[PDB]
Each structure stands twice: as C-alpha cells, then as structure tokens.
Design an enzyme around this catalytic site. Structure first.
Site, PDB file in Angstrom:
ATOM      1  N   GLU A  17      -8.985  49.090  45.540  1.00 43.97           N
ATOM      2  CA  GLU A  17      -8.245  48.929  46.762  1.00 43.97           C
ATOM      3  C   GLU A  17      -8.555  47.676  47.574  1.00 43.97           C
ATOM      4  O   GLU A  17      -7.717  47.260  48.363  1.00 43.97           O
ATOM      5  CB  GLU A  17      -8.597  50.122  47.647  1.00 43.97           C
ATOM      6  CG  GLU A  17      -8.098  51.429  47.051  1.00 43.97           C
ATOM      7  CD  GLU A  17      -6.602  51.599  47.016  1.00 43.97           C
ATOM      8  OE1 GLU A  17      -6.064  52.529  46.465  1.00 43.97           O
ATOM      9  OE2 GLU A  17      -5.943  50.689  47.666  1.00 43.97           O
ATOM     10  N   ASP A  68       0.768  47.244  51.721  1.00 46.56           N
ATOM     11  CA  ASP A  68       0.319  47.593  50.382  1.00 46.56           C
ATOM     12  C   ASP A  68       1.312  47.154  49.291  1.00 46.56           C
ATOM     13  O   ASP A  68       2.296  46.471  49.551  1.00 46.56           O
ATOM     14  CB  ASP A  68      -0.132  49.059  50.291  1.00 46.56           C
ATOM     15  CG  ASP A  68       0.981  50.094  50.260  1.00 46.56           C
ATOM     16  OD1 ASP A  68       0.800  51.277  50.229  1.00 46.56           O
ATOM     17  OD2 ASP A  68       2.160  49.620  50.265  1.00 46.56           O
TER      18      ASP A  68
END
Ligand SMILES: [Cl-]
Ligand SMILES: [Cl-]
Length: 162
Positions: free
Chosen positions: A11, A20
């Site tokens: 991540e 994202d």
C-alpha cells in the site's frame, strides 16, 4: 515478515490525501476515506477519523494508528464472516496473512464473493486456487500486487515479498 510489513509494502505510506488506483480519496497506509468525488467530503471524513482539524495532512503516527485499526478490523471482519472464517481457520500462518491482505484491499464482501477460490483454498489445492484467483477483475486491475498475494497462497512462503 508479518501482515503489517506485508501490507506496508503493498500500500505504501502517504501523509497527504491521495487518490487510490480506483480514483478514491485515501490517506496513510491504504486507508480509504470516501468513494465520493468531493475532496471536501474526503477532508471531513479525515478529520472525523483523526479527531482534529487536519487540512488533509497527517503525521506518521496518525497514519500508523489508522493502519493498526484497519488491520484489526480486517481480521475481525474475517472472523465474523460465515464464509471467511472457515477458510481462515483452515490455513497456515502465512496464507492467513494473504487472506487478510485481500480483505484489507477489497473488503469482506468482495473476498467473500470469491466462492470457488475459497473452496479451493480450504481444500488445499494451491495451484488450482492460484489459477482461479487470477481470473478476476482484481488481478487484471492490480496485477503486480495480485501476483504477490497469489504467490503467497500457492507457496505458503514470503518469497514474493523478499
Ligand atoms: Cl475510521
Ligand atoms: Cl499492482
């Protein structure tokens, strides 16, 4: 290697609101803020999550704190889920990390939707489950991360992350 270090590699860490891979407002270590297009709805959620006026920026500590909650929630969601729990219980420690990872990224509902792969994991048919897992939008959209997770399931080792 452990779940925390694994997810931190997958991540990354960003201290300013970002978008994202799907275009949603996120912050820290993959902490989804909102699916709404409004940066303001994002700042609001953020301040709500941290307990302060943040103006879209947080400290490392704040990030890690969100991360601790999220891993905890991920695990507890698996344990409360009728479809997930039995899979998790049947797996060894490494493979458990792989399932938590999927849950953290896609939510309990989504993972729970991988019916066939779940059944193959439970049966310990590693190669077959790896093949089935790859036929998904998930693998097609985030192929490098998916391959790492998939290799973890196939192998039962942390090789993909070393
Ligand atoms: Cl929260
Ligand atoms: Cl990827």
């Amino acid at each position: 290697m452990n779940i925390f270090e694994m997810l931190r590699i997958d991540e990354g860490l960003r201290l300013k609101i970002y978008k994202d891979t799907e275009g949603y407002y996120t912050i820290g270590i993959g902490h989804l803020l909102t699916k709404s297009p409004s940066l303001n709805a994002a700042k609001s959620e953020l301040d709500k999550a941290i307990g302060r006026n943040t103006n879209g920026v947080i400290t490392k500590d704040e990030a890690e704190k969100l991360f601790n909650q999220d891993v905890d929630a991920a695990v507890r969601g698996i344990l409360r889920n009728a479809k997930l729990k039995p899979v998790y219980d049947s797996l060894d420690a490494v493979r458990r990390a792989a399932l938590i990872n999927m849950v953290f990224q896609m939510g309990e509902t989504g993972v729970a939707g991988f019916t066939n792969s779940l059944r193959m994991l439970q049966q310990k048919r590693w190669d077959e489950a790896a093949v089935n897992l790859a036929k998904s939008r998930w693998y097609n959209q985030t192929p490098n991360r998916a391959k790492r997770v998939i290799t973890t399931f196939r192998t039962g080792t942390w090789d993909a992350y070393k």
